[PDB]
Amino acid sequence: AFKDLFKFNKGKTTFVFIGGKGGVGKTTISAATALWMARSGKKTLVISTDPAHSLSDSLEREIGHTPTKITENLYAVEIDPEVAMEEYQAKLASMSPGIDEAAAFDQFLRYMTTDEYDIVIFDTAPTGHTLRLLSFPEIMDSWVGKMIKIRRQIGSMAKAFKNILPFMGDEEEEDRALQDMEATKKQINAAREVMSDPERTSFKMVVIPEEMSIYESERAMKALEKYSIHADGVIVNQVLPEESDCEFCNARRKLQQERLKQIREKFSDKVVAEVPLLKKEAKGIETLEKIAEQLYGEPE
Amino acid sequence: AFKDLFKFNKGKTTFVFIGGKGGVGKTTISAATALWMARSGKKTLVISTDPAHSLSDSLEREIGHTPTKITENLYAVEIDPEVAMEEYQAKDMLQDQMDMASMSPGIDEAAAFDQFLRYMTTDEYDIVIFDTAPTGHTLRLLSFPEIMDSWVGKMIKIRRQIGSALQDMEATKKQINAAREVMSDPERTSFKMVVIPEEMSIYESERAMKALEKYSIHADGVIVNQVLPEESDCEFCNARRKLQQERLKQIREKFSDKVVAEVPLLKKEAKGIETLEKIAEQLYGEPE
Numbered sequence: 001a002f003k004d005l006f007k008f009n010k011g012k013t014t015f016v017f018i019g020g021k022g023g024v025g026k027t028t029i030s031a032a033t034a035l036w037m038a039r040s041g042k043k044t045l046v047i048s049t050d051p052a053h054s055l056s057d058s059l060e061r062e063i064g065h066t067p068t069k070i071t072e073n074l075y076a077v078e079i080d081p082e083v084a085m086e087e088y089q090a091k092l093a094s095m096s097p098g099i100d101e102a103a104a105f106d107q108f109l110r111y112m113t114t115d116e117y118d119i120v121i122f123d124t125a126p127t128g129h130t131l132r133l134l135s136f137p138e139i140m141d142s143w144v145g146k147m148i149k150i151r152r153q154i155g156s157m158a159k160a161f162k163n164i165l166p167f168m169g170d171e172e173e174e175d176r177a178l179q180d181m182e183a184t185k186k187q188i189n190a191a192r193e194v195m196s197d198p199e200r201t202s203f204k205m206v207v208i209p210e211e212m213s214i215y216e217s218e219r220a221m222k223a224l225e226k227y228s229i230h231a232d233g234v235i236v237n238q239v240l241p242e243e244s245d246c247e248f249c250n251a252r253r254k255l256q257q258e259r260l261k262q263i264r265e266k267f268s269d270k271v272v273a274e275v276p277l278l279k280k281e282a283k284g285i286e287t288l289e290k291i292a293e294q295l296y297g298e299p300e
Numbered sequence: 301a302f303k304d305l306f307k308f309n310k311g312k313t314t315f316v317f318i319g320g321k322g323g324v325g326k327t328t329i330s331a332a333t334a335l336w337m338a339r340s341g342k343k344t345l346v347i348s349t350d351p352a353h354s355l356s357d358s359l360e361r362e363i364g365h366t367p368t369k370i371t372e373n374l375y376a377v378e379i380d381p382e383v384a385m386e387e388y389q390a391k392d393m394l395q396d397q398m399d400m401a402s403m404s405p406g407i408d409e410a411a412a413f414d415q416f417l418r419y420m421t422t423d424e425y426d427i428v429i430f431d432t433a434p435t436g437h438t439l440r441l442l443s444f445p446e447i448m449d450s451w452v453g454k455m456i457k458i459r460r461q462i463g464s465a466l467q468d469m470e471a472t473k474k475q476i477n478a479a480r481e482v483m484s485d486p487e488r489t490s491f492k493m494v495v496i497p498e499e500m501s502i503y504e505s506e507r508a509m510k511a512l513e514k515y516s517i518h519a520d521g522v523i524v525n526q527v528l529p530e531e532s533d534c535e536f537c538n539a540r541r542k543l544q545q546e547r548l549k550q551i552r553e554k555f556s557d558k559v560v561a562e563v564p565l566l567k568k569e570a571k572g573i574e575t576l577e578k579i580a581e582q583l584y585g586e587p588e
């Protein structure tokens with residue numbers, strides 16, 4: 001019933017963030033889930049916000065900043081902050097730290113605005129920077145709100161003597177600019193509100209059965225349910241299969257099964273599902289669809 | 301001879317960045333390396349720049365923002381950007397700005413760069429090892445000095461033009477450029493890349509090695525971690541080892557201008573000082 005953790009509302013894009021520690025399979029799960037959604041008839045966009053993109057390696061397809069068709073109903077984007085800058089200036093250094101998260105938030109605004117997709121899936125950077133991304137809207141909201149407030153105060157002062165001294169300011173134009181800033185703020189705030197709406201946005205946590213991943217994600221889940229991001233599902237990836245006759249495997253599997261117990265105890269309030277480690281690398285559409293089919297069942 | 305890739309100049313801090321894709325073992329290798337340097341008599345600081353810190357989990361010790369003793373000759377830091385900010389303001393248009401900036405995207409990389417500035421100055425450690433964030437944000441860190449330089453400059457001329465401490469901002473600008481020189485100086489600074497024998501780690505790290513070129517970062521060594529040992533001989537292991545061994549050949553081909561070393565996958569998780577020392581010893585030999 002992991003597949004039931006995805007809700008859809010006709011005409012309102014569903015958002016899903018796939019997150020977790022480095023190397024646990026975020027990109028693998030994102031690409032498999034997106035392919036599954038596409039086969040299910042959902043118009044799907046999967047977007048990589050990791051500045052070292054891997055979605056293209058994972059699907060084995062060239063993918064750009066603008067939506068790239070992968071297959072019927074599946075489109076993909078690897079965010080390029082240089083291009084994101086251009087699309088910003090045009091609307092109203094592309095290499096400074098923080099730019100990747102600002103450009104990722106811009107993508108969220110775009111698709112929230114158009115509602116062109118049934119579901120948008122974010123393939124996120126490793127934990128620490130994705131928590132920055134997810135807390136960025138509230139910060140952007142406060143900042144824009146403060147700029148507007150200050151700008152209004154300076155305006156009030158500036159025109160306070162128009163009845164005593166010649167005041168040459170253009171109030172019309174000033175009022176339009178304030179109105180434009182307020183509309184930008186309303187957009188930022190609307191997005192913060194969609195992100196913490198469990199009916200629109202969810203976060204699926206990927207872990208592997210190893211303590212360093214478990215502990216990181218346990219800290220992350222706490223930080224998430226602080227920001228009111230709905231984090232309802234945990235996927236345990238790279239689980240060694242029973243078919244392990246050898247002594248090296250047996251030691252590792254025995255330890256993984258104890259970690260699975262810890263996982264089910266630490267995330268006891270969540271739905272937990274497993275994805276087995278394959279005999280080969282998880283890479284390539286056919287392999288990704290088989291992972292999706294075992295996790296979610298056959299596409300509807 | 302992998303250990304020969306670490307050059308030391310007494311009185312002058314050696315810098316090492318350990319980088320790579322998520323999950324490949326940067327923290328494990330950083331911590332194993334740091335313990336080895338310390339056992340070897342080098343006064344060693346290992347600094348996590350990954351905003352989700354794992355050094356504490358790896359070394360199994362509580363570590364703070366303040367250098368934290370781990371063993372003789374070894375200290376550790378998990379950067380806390382808020383403490384870095386009050387520290388930085390210690391040396392309401394601004395207040396709200398500082399508190400907001402202290403939680404904003406990019407603050408982690410700025411705070412990491414501040415650590416570099418602090419120790420390149422006071423050569424107090426023989427070696428400082430950066431346990432970096434995964435590839436993509438570590439590139440932002442490594443290109444940050446050029447951006448900082450330009451930015452401070454722009455800020456300079458703009459403060460002047462405004463009239464109604466330019467002597468200080470001006471110093472920090474030279475500090476920044478002195479740091480770039482240290483960073484691109486192969487006698488002082490190196491980058492070790494960690495990869496696992498899987499295509500997604502290989503391609504990401506090949507691309508990253510190219511972006512470091514542009515920055516003149518000296519990358520001289522590749523560590524291939526989590527290599528399945530030969531003993532494993534069940535059907536499942538053999539199939540995986542056979543693939544890894546083809547990936548090792550690709551790694552050696554693609555990083556042919558670098559020295560390549562392997563670290564075996566253990567039968568348990570790599571963590572705790574005892575296990576980490578075994579890894580350093582298998583990788584670098586006994587200390588001195």
Ligand SMILES: Nc1ncnc2c1ncn2[C@@H]1O[C@H](COP(=O)(O)OP(=O)(O)O)[C@@H](O)[C@H]1O
Pocket residue numbers: 020021022023024025026027028029054237238239275276277278279280281282283322498499500501
């Ligand atoms: N279930 C699996 N079985 C086998 N290999 C896997 C599995 N899931 C992920 N991988 C491999 O593990 C590595 C990390 O997966 P990746 O999706 O890149 O992770 P992240 O996006 O979290 O960095 C890749 O080499 C991928 O092929």
Ligand SMILES: Nc1ncnc2c1ncn2[C@@H]1O[C@H](COP(=O)(O)OP(=O)(O)O)[C@@H](O)[C@H]1O
Pocket residue numbers: 022210211212213320321322323324325326327328329354525526527563564565566567568569570571
């Ligand atoms: N050689 C190894 N053998 C077994 N487990 C390992 C080995 N190297 C690392 N690990 C395990 O792999 C996972 C990731 O290692 P970690 O150092 O956190 O990576 P990164 O810093 O690149 O995120 C951890 O659970 C760690 O214990």
Ligand code: ALF
Pocket residue numbers: 021022023126321322323324326327350354432433434
């Ligand atoms: F997943 Al990491 F450093 F913890 F890349």
Ligand code: ALF
Pocket residue numbers: 021022023024026027050054124125126321322323434
């Ligand atoms: F290592 Al990644 F997404 F590639 F965490």
Ligand SMILES: [K+]
Pocket residue numbers: 050052053054321322504
């Ligand atoms: K990546």
Ligand SMILES: [K+]
Pocket residue numbers: 021022216350352353354
């Ligand atoms: K981490």
Ligand SMILES: [Mg+2]
Pocket residue numbers: 025026027028050054123124
């Ligand atoms: Mg990924």
Ligand SMILES: [Mg+2]
Pocket residue numbers: 325326327328350354431432
């Ligand atoms: Mg790490």
Ligand SMILES: [Zn+2]
Pocket residue numbers: 244245246247248249250532533534535536537538
């Ligand atoms: Zn085996």
